């Protein structure tokens, strides 16, 4: 994955800017432009106006400018969701921020609010079209994240909004496996009531029951047996 897709633009080097232009030409089917159309770094790109972009690229400048704004607003929303800043989330969405923006790990605002326990933000994102089943780079969904971190009310809201109870990540772990690993008995019970496959096996040959034993969560193993 190229640097410019892994960094916020304020950190892009001069070379990153050139690579971004070439990436955008292909991603957005734009008229080709010379790699030196913007002889500057990312911090400099952020100083230019839309009119400056249009001057430098008559065919694509407006698009390029708006792609950068999309990244900036997306990052503010990710950070506001992570930090539980309900008011900032509200302002950013009213300002058009992408509710399905992703960070360097594939985490969306919904992933971050779910992982950090911010129930009101989870609810507002879902009401406004956040993808309840978005999968990060390793296959983790918002439901995995809420289950692993012990946020029962969020688990319930995600399930009510259509979260896949049996989604599996790159290691074959379902939300049930993660709840078992971290000892979250009440979450295990909710997942089971919503159709979690108690017999799902991870890439290491283990079920949730095995994981619960391995982690000393004997109360969970009890619930899983019966």
Q: How far apart are the first and last CA of the chain?
A: 46
Q: How far is the CB of 62 from K ion (least distance, A)?
A: 27
Q: Tell which residue, 171, 111, 107, 169, has the closest CA to residue 140.
A: 169
Q: Which of 42, 74 has the CB closer to Cl ion?
A: 74
Tokens 């969306």 belong to 108
Piece of the chain touching K ion by CB under 5 A; list 56-64, 105-113, 159-167, 189-197: 105-113
Q: Is 139 in the site for K ion (CB under 5 A)?
A: no
Find the binder of Cl ion among 7, 40, 67, 73 (CB under 5 A).
73
Piece of the chain touching Cl ion by CB under 5 A; list 15-23, 62-70, 122-130, 188-196: 62-70
> Cβ of 216: how many Cβ atoms within 10 Å?
10
DSSP state of 31: P
Distance (Å, whole) CA 133 – CA 110:
10
Site string for Cl ion, 145-184 (x = CB under 5 A): -----------------------x----------------
Q: Which of 107, 168 has the CB closer to Cl ion?
A: 168
B/e letters for 138-174, b = 16+ CB within 10 Å, e = fewer, are: eebbbbbbbbbbbbbebbbbbbebebbbebbbeeebb
Q: Is 100 in the site for Cl ion (CB under 5 A)?
A: no
Contact residues: K ion, CB under 5 A: 102, 106, 134, 136
Contact residues: Cl ion, CB under 5 A: 70, 73-74, 97-98, 168, 200-201
């Amino acid at each position: 994955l190229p640097a410019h897709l892994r960094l916020q633009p304020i950190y892009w080097s001069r070379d990153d800017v050139a690579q971004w232009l070439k990436w955008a030409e292909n991603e957005f089917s734009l008229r080709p432009i010379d790699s030196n159309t913007f002889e500057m770094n990312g911090k400099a790109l952020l100083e230019l106006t839309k009119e400056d972009f249009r001057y430098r690229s008559p065919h694509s400048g407006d698009e390029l400018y708006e792609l950068l704004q999309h990244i900036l607003l997306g990052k503010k929303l990710l950070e506001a969701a992570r930090a539980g800043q309900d008011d900032e989330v509200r302002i950013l969405m009213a300002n058009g921020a992408d509710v399905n923006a992703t960070d360097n790990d594939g985490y969306t605002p919904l992933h971050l609010a779910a992982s950090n326990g911010h129930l009101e933000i989870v609810e507002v994102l879902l009401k406004n079209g956040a993808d309840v089943n978005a999968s990060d780079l390793t296959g983790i969904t918002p439901l995995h994240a809420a289950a692993a971190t012990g946020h029962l009310e969020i688990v319930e809201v995600l399930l009510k909004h259509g979260a896949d109870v049996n989604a599996y990540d790159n290691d074959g772990h379902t939300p049930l496996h993660l709840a078992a690993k971290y000892g979250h008995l009440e979450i295990v019970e909710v997942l089971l009531k919503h159709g979690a496959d108690v017999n799902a096996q991870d890439k290491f040959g283990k079920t949730a029951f095995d994981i619960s034993i391995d982690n000393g969560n004997e109360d969970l193993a009890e619930i899983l047996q019966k």
